[PDB]
Design a protein around this ligand. Structure first.
Ligand SMILES: COC1=C(OC)C(=O)C(C/C=C(\C)CC/C=C(\C)CC/C=C(\C)CC/C=C(\C)CC/C=C(\C)CC/C=C(\C)CC/C=C(/C)CC/C=C(\C)CC/C=C(\C)CCC=C(C)C)=C(C)C1=O
Ligand SMILES: COC1=C(OC)C(=O)C(C/C=C(\C)CC/C=C(\C)CC/C=C(\C)CC/C=C(\C)CC/C=C(\C)CC/C=C(\C)CC/C=C(/C)CC/C=C(\C)CC/C=C(\C)CCC=C(C)C)=C(C)C1=O
Ligand SMILES: COC[C@@H](CCO[C@H]1CC[C@@]2(C)C(=CC[C@H]3[C@@H]4C[C@@H]5O[C@]6(CC[C@@H](C)CO6)[C@@H](C)[C@@H]5[C@@]4(C)CC[C@@H]32)C1)CO[C@@H]1O[C@H](CO)[C@@H](O[C@H]2O[C@H](CO)[C@@H](O)[C@H](O)[C@H]2O)[C@H](O)[C@H]1O
Ligand SMILES: COC[C@@H](CCO[C@H]1CC[C@@]2(C)C(=CC[C@H]3[C@@H]4C[C@@H]5O[C@]6(CC[C@@H](C)CO6)[C@@H](C)[C@@H]5[C@@]4(C)CC[C@@H]32)C1)CO[C@@H]1O[C@H](CO)[C@@H](O[C@H]2O[C@H](CO)[C@@H](O)[C@H](O)[C@H]2O)[C@H](O)[C@H]1O
Ligand code: HEC
Ligand code: HEC
Ligand code: HEM
Ligand code: HEM
Ligand code: HEM
Ligand code: HEM
Ligand code: FES
Lengths: 16, 232, 194, 403, 403, 204
């Protein structure tokens, strides 16, 4: 619950 | 004219969302250097590992201050004004001022960063929450009709009775991730976290003060009896 | 004044005094409590990785671990043979009363004999002793065989960190929890695998 | 123990001092609310000394770390925020208690003969307190700290000839900087505390030499019983010690309420702009003094001329020194002074409050007009005292205190 | 002025205090060299307070800037080097003068009845001075400073149970750090100076209550003239005021010679390794205390057990407190005590000096043996006093002071 | 160890200037003199401010700045195994005789990390940075002929000037201290005469 609340805004799409 | 916000410092979820917003959208330019990640995690109820993984982006330790890489002199050169440390900004400006300021950015081509602020005219801060709020402009929109404080709501639906006004902050539709209520809640959580950061001892202060005042009332009873008696 | 009620006066004085003393203790609580280690102090420290392959024979290097100096000394053979000859002058030759990892040699107080990692803080009043690997210095006497000499009050330790008998230092120099990440690299702060 | 006290008394006048100053020291029995404030001033001085010593354990008197050290106290030091709020609230409460103390002196003519030296020592204490609070307010090194110090020391630049050199010498630098911070810290932490303690000692010694006034202005020493004790006199210990204990508990209730619930006190005990770090290049939109300096500020702001404004501000405090010789009333207490004295005391209190209220805000037309009027009235309360204390008709002072 | 003093005296105890303490206060007329040191201790205390106040205006009590701020005083502050040398040489001179003062007390039995409280307040002053000097010596944050602080704070670690927790609580940190430096700065600059001023006031008040001893140990109060003035008594003002002025000038000559030509005094006033910044990981090969702490350090070094050594130092200081009850001699002065008392006073002086001398250098075999012997002799001087002050035969004390 | 005595003259402006030059060129690479300012060194050595900036300030600092260096203590401690201590107060920490003997006691020792050892400071972490001037010194210390720019006397003079500058840096107030102390002691003797006469007059 806290982890979802604290998710960083920037999402990076990575190879594999 | 500021907008009132009811900030609940006992709301851990709201403070957590505000801390996330501060760490992502604000710590790019603003430090919270008088405040440690460890204390923020302890007070917000965030596990230390979770705080490390989710809110500490600068490689600092858990016990380190919320410092950022942007130096005040560099940022003053770049923006025309140094982004102040935001640990105590809630105390410096108040929570209502912050709530109104973070929601009062509107497009202004005459300005260096293309935006101005109703609360802080000619502020040097770029509108960094534009992706969330969306494009906000000084235009015409529906505002509740008021006549000498005679505020009209709809008796049946309970919604305001509105008339058009052309000097109002209006968000261009489908321009931001969050609607007005969602951005209001985002800004409320951010200002709640800033209010906590400015005064992290508030809740403990109230508890300790309650106990101190109870003790002092007890001691006053005894001292008053020892005085009125012995004055006979 | 007409017939002061004693006992009532005595009781009120005593009760007010006791309540005021309780309040004085409470008001002292902030001042006494502020002297405990603060958040600045509690920053703690992380394990330090030290490359020990470059230590020349009979020499030591200082490693900064958690704000303390750690003597990492590459022990030559001759002093290793001399160390058992000193057991009669050591308060705790077997390190029964000292602080050291469970996995270090009780006598050599190290994972491997040729290298000794010792928390370089004297066990009496806490300073780093001076490293004196020489055999028989004039000041340290002829019975000396190399070791550590505390410069405050002259506590003597052998090269294994074991204190001599009847020194101000009552205990052997602490051995930090360390491992050998490689044949020539150690880490101070993490225990060695069982 | 009796034997222990006999041993001590042969070697130290412990019992003699105790019976000369607290027990067997007969003060008027008609002290009222207004006589709680000397002991409360002592309590606040002790609070300031203790909490300041503890703040000094963590404070850094450098322009690079003063503000950061204050935040370190507020957040990192265990209960350090409590100590800091005790100190700030205690400075504000020191000035509250001292102003009520001085107003008691005004109300009951307690500055008059024989207490002229008591009043002068009290005024020296007030000067030391003002210097101490001003130098302390620079220590946080916030915006208000820095800029208030800048303006207050630029005032020394108003002296016609040596003004600029004197201001530079006081600052220790060409502007307010960490040098000024460290210097004011040293003065605030040792020198002025020592001066204040000595002045308080002298003040209490002078008072005990001449004895306390009372709300009725009755010289209780005139009427004495067969034992030599004044008829209207009671031993300070235990009666007034227990009374002052009750007063101290009430004061502590208010003090702790402020500390733990409203430490900023609406931005007056801890000013909001002072929570921003000092910026030598950006000055606050409106810079104002701490509330307890606001009245004199208003006076200084009421005078269009700079040098004359500084002179008037200084005289506003200096005239209280000569107050004992300005009062020509045959009676001490306002209860028995003529209507003119009561009216002028009301005018002086109202003018002081209005000056403080309007010196706490940015200049305004009505604010400026009222500040000038109140400056005139504040100075007239003293200048006209030697006249209206004689023109008025005073009531006969009772032989025995009322109550 | 006569009129001004008449005005003051009706409102202040000015003339009465002057005539009770300085004028019309009849001290023995046979004070010798050994009676200069109370006034000199007062002067050195004033010098320490003033120079320390001025140093505090430029000192930064942080581990990052303490040493740098000391060098800033030495180099950038105009005459700051003078003030710093006055302060350090004044600490050394404070201990010189205080040791000679205590030795006068030993020589002439000035601790004996009725001056037991005078002696106890003097010992409290000496404890406060030891603590003050130690905390001040930590402030420069040199190698000597850091490692002396480490050792002395770890002394509290010797307590079997609460020792480590107490040492950590005194440090404010898990090791000597800027927290310890700042805390000791606060204690050194305000708390202990205030305590020392209070203790000096109590000391002098006790002395004036019981009266001053003299080299002959003659109670001059027994013989008085028709006016009540002792036959061997002279008003302290002006005779001893001028004598103390001469003593003050001689002391100032020596003091300024040291300040301006030998401020280090061969590394005994300003220690050479203290000119290096504190290093947590490098303990100086010669980590020895300041000279005036060497005699006790030697004692602690003499004892081969940690806790026993700590207790031995503590008792070496504490035995002087009970000294007034250890001396059972029928006479005060060493001039009229038996050969045993003179021999044991010589033994005590030699043992103290030898402990200080060997406590000032690294451990050695002869050094260790002499330190142990002198520790035994130092403690025997006190433990055996109740016996050898009775075994010895004392010469009769004259009814009048000799000279 | 046995030290060589050197007579340090703090009134020799030329010697102190040469020592400052040597310190700026050969010693400020690893050592700071961060507790003294270029401006004060120039003033006390008689060096014009422009000349000081041109000839002795290599870091780009202002005349009024501390003689700081780029080499941070932590990096230097890692690189050399020991941090090069700030040398502003080294003449007080060690004394001028110790410095004079130490800077002339470097000899070649292949077993050491930097190929040198020191008689005064055994196993010291300093590289022999003055080897170009002194030449190759080997073990009694002897300089290999035709290996340095300077001979024994010239290198001794160079080290003496450097140590004189270091002595000044440790105690920049010494000359002013003596000058002021002379007058203070004269005044105190003058005042002692009067105080003694007053005491003698009163004690009749
Ligand atoms: C917006 O803005 C504004 C506000 O703000 C926001 C305001 O608030 C205000 C309103 C302001 C107020 C009302 C606030 C007022 C506050 C204040 C009053 C603050 C003022 C504080 C200062 C500026 C500090 C100024 C301090 C000064 C000028 C005094 C300086 C004193 C010294 C430096 C002391 C000198 C040191 C000395 C003398 C050394 C000691 C001498 C010795 C000789 C020592 C002894 C030595 C020996 C014994 C050796 C010699 C031996 C002898 C004598 C021989 C014989 C031996 C014997 C001993 C007998 C305004 C107007 C404002 O618009
Ligand atoms: C080589 O190396 C070596 C050397 O070195 C180089 C050495 O030299 C030495 C040699 C060593 C020496 C000889 C040196 C010796 C030096 C020393 C002894 C120095 C030791 C100094 C220290 C370590 C400091 C230790 C300090 C301690 C333990 C004491 C701590 C005290 C405090 C923190 C104070 C406590 C705080 C309190 C209680 C606050 C006050 C509380 C209140 C209640 C205040 C009042 C509050 C109110 C009024 C509110 C409540 C109201 C009430 C009461 C209600 C009624 C109302 C009324 C007011 C009446 C050796 C061996 C060595 O080998
Ligand atoms: C172990 O004794 C130490 C000395 C003799 C020791 O003389 C003693 C001389 C007296 C004195 C100062 C001593 C203790 C307590 C002291 C008292 C406490 C009380 O306090 C006070 C105040 C408090 C009150 C409560 C009570 O009263 C007093 C009035 C009392 C008091 C202060 C008075 C005086 C006492 C030591 C013998 O030393 C041997 O020699 C070596 C020592 O290190 C050891 O050798 C080993 O270690 C070496 C390393 O160097 C190697 O060389 C070797 O190879 C290796 O074998 C060996 O083990 C050891 O025995
Ligand atoms: C424009 O409207 C004026 C309204 C009055 C006012 C505020 C103005 C200029 C000077 C002020 C005086 C200077 C003297 O200063 C004081 C103190 C200094 C004394 C030397 C002289 O008197 C005043 C009584 C005197 C004084 C404080 C009283 C009031 C004067 C502005
Ligand atoms: C979360 C998105 C943020 C919040 C909440 C705040 N900031 Fe900023 N900001 C920036 C600059 C260059 C300034 C100075 C502008 C000027 O002085 O004219 C500011 C200012 C503020 C203020 C005003 C504080 C005050 O006391 O006046 C507040 C309350 C504030 N900011 C809150 C720049 C930036 C920036 C760089 C792109 C970022 C990412 C943010 N600000 C983010 C936030
Ligand atoms: C880097 C190549 C250096 C230069 C150039 C100079 N010094 Fe140095 N010095 C250096 C180190 C790494 C050390 C520490 C050695 C150790 O084992 O601790 C030193 C030390 C000194 C000292 C000793 C000071 C003390 O121990 O208190 C002195 C007196 C000294 N250095 C002087 C000095 C002079 C005069 C230099 C120019 C001729 C000089 N150093 C250059 C590294 C380096
Ligand atoms: C009459 C007595 C005193 C008064 C009126 C007084 C007043 C003040 C004031 C108003 C401040 C500003 C606080 C703020 O706004 O943050 C302050 C700060 C400070 N004071 Fe004092 N003070 C007094 C005595 C002392 C003493 C005796 C000491 C130390 C021995 C001390 C140490 C400090 C310190 C370290 C600060 C900076 C920390 C802080 O601002 O809280 N004070 N003082
Ligand atoms: C700031 C610290 C001060 C302390 C600790 C202090 C202390 C005291 C105390 C304990 C008393 C006796 C009890 C009482 O009358 O309340 C007293 C009386 C008095 N004080 Fe204060 N005082 C201070 C400041 C002042 C000031 C600023 C003034 C005036 C400018 C002043 C003027 C007087 C007078 C005139 C009296 C005696 C009046 C009477 O007997 O009614 N004092 N003081
Ligand atoms: C450190 C600051 C001290 C100051 C300022 C001070 C002050 C004085 C003064 C002015 C006198 C009278 C004049 C004189 O005897 O020279 C005196 C006497 C005396 N002092 Fe102190 N003293 C201090 C420390 C001590 C200490 C540490 C002791 C003993 C442990 C002590 C014990 C005595 C005794 C016993 C006398 C009476 C001497 C006699 O009557 O013959 N004092 N002191
Ligand atoms: C009996 C009174 C005092 C004694 C015996 C004493 C002793 C000392 C000593 C020995 C030092 C070390 C100086 C050095 O080695 O460089 C020192 C440092 C210092 N003292 Fe005190 N001191 C006293 C009172 C004071 C007071 C009252 C203050 C401030 C008001 C003060 C301020 C300082 C400062 C700022 C330092 C650090 C700067 C420096 O080391 O010169 N001292 N003190
Ligand atoms: S400090 Fe190590 S033997 Fe005392």
């Amino acid at each position: 619950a806290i982890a979802k609340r604290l998710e960083p805004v920037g999402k990076v799409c990575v190879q594999g | 004219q500021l907008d009132h916000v009811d900030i609940d410092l006992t709301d851990k979820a709201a403070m957590q969302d505000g801390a996330r917003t501060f760490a992502n959208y604000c710590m790019g330019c603003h430090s919270a250097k008088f405040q440690r990640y460890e204390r923020v995690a302890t007070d917000l109820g965030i596990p230390a590992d979770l705080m490390m993984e989710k809110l500490v982006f600068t490689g600092a330790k858990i016990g380190d201050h919320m410092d950022i890489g942007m130096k005040p002199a560099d940022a003053k050169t770049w923006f025309g004004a140094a982004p102040p440390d935001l640990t105590l900004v809630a105390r410096v400006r108040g929570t209502d001022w912050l709530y109104s300021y973070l929601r009062s950015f509107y497009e202004d081509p005459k300005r260096p960063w293309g935006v101005n602020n109703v609360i802080f005219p000619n502020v040097g801060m770029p509108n960094v929450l534009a992706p969330l709020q969306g494009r906000q402009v000084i235009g015409c929109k529906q505002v509740q009709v008021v006549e000498d404080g005679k505020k009209q709501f709809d008796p049946l639906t309970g919604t305001p009775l509105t008339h058009e006004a052309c000097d109002q902050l209006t968000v261009v539709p489908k321009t931001g991730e969050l609607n007005e209520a969602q951005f209001d809640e985002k800004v409320k959580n951010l200002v709640t976290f800033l209010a906590y950061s400015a005064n992290p001892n508030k809740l403990a202060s109230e508890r300790i003060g309650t106990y101190v005042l109870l003790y002092l009332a007890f001691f006053f009873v005894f001292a008053y009896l020892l005085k009125r008696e012995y004055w006979k | 004044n007409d017939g002061v009620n004693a006992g009532r006066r005595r009781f009120l004085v005593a009760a007010t005094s006791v309540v005021g003393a309780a309040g004085a203790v409470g008001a002292a609580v902030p001042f006494v409590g502020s002297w405990f280690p603060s958040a600045k102090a509690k920053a703690a420290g992380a394990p330090v990785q030290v490359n020990v392959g470059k230590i020349d024979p009979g020499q030591q290097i200082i490693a900064e671990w958690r704000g303390k100096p750690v003597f990492i000394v590459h022990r030559t053979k001759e002093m290793l043979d001399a160390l058992p000859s000193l057991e009669g002058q050591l308060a705790d030759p077997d390190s029964k009363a000292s602080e050291q990892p469970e996995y270090v040699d009780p006598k050599l107080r190290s994972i491997k004999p040729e290298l000794a990692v010792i928390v370089g803080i004297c066990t009496h009043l806490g300073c780093s002793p001076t490293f004196r690997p020489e055999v028989a210095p004039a000041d340290l006497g002829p019975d000396w065989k190399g070791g550590y000499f505390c410069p405050c009050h002259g506590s003597h330790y052998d090269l294994a960190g074991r204190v001599y008998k009847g020194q101000p230092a009552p205990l052997n120099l602490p051995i930090p929890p360390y491992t050998f990440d490689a044949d020539d690299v150690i880490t101070i702060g993490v225990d060695q695998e069982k | 123990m009796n034997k222990f006290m006999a041993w001590v008394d042969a070697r130290f006048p412990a019992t003699k001092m105790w019976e000369d100053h607290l027990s067997k020291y007969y003060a008027p029995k008609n002290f009222n609310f207004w006589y709680f404030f000397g002991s409360l001033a002592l309590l606040v001085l002790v609070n300031q000394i203790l909490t300041g010593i503890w703040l000094t354990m963590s404070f850094t008197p450098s322009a690079e770390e003063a503000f950061a050290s204050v935040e370190y106290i507020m957040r990192d030091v265990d209960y350090g925020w409590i100590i800091r709020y005790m100190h700030s609230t205690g400075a504000s409460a020191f000035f509250i208690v001292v102003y009520l103390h001085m107003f008691r002196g005004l109300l009951y003519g307690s500055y008059q003969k024989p207490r002229e030296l008591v009043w002068i020592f009290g005024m020296l204490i007030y000067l030391a307190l003002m210097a101490e609070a001003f130098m302390g307010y620079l220590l946080p090194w916030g915006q208000m700290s820095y800029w208030g110090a800048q303006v207050i020391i630029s005032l020394f630049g108003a002296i016609p000839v040596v003004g600029e050199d004197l201001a530079q010498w006081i600052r220790g630098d060409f502007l307010i900087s960490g040098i000024t911070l460290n210097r004011f810290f040293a003065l605030h932490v040792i020198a002025l505390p020592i001066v204040l303690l000595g002045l308080v000692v002298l003040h209490i010694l002078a008072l005990h030499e001449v004895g306390s006034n009372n709300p009725d202005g009755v010289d209780i020493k005139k009427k004495k019983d067969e034992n030599g004790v004044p008829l209207d006199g009671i031993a300070f210990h235990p009666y007034y010690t227990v009374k002052d204990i009750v007063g101290v508990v009430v004061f502590l209730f208010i003090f702790c309420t402020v500390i733990f619930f409203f430490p900023e006190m609406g931005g007056y005990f801890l000013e909001k702009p002072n929570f921003e770090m000092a910026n030598q290049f950006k000055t606050p939109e409106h810079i104002a003094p701490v509330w307890y300096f606001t009245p004199f500020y208003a006076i200084l702001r009421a005078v269009p001329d700079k040098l004359m404004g500084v002179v008037a501000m200084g005289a506003a405090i200096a005239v209280l020194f000569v107050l004992p010789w300005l009062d020509r009333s045959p009676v001490r207490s306002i209860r028995y002074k003529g209507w003119l004295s009561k009216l002028w005391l009301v005018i002086f209190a109202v003018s002081f409050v209005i000056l403080g209220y309007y010196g706490a805000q940015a200049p305004s037309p009505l604010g400026t007009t009222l500040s000038r009027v109140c400056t005139v009235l504040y100075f007239a309360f003293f200048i006209l005292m030697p006249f209206y204390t004689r023109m008025e008709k005073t009531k006969p002072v009772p032989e025995r205190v009322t109550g």
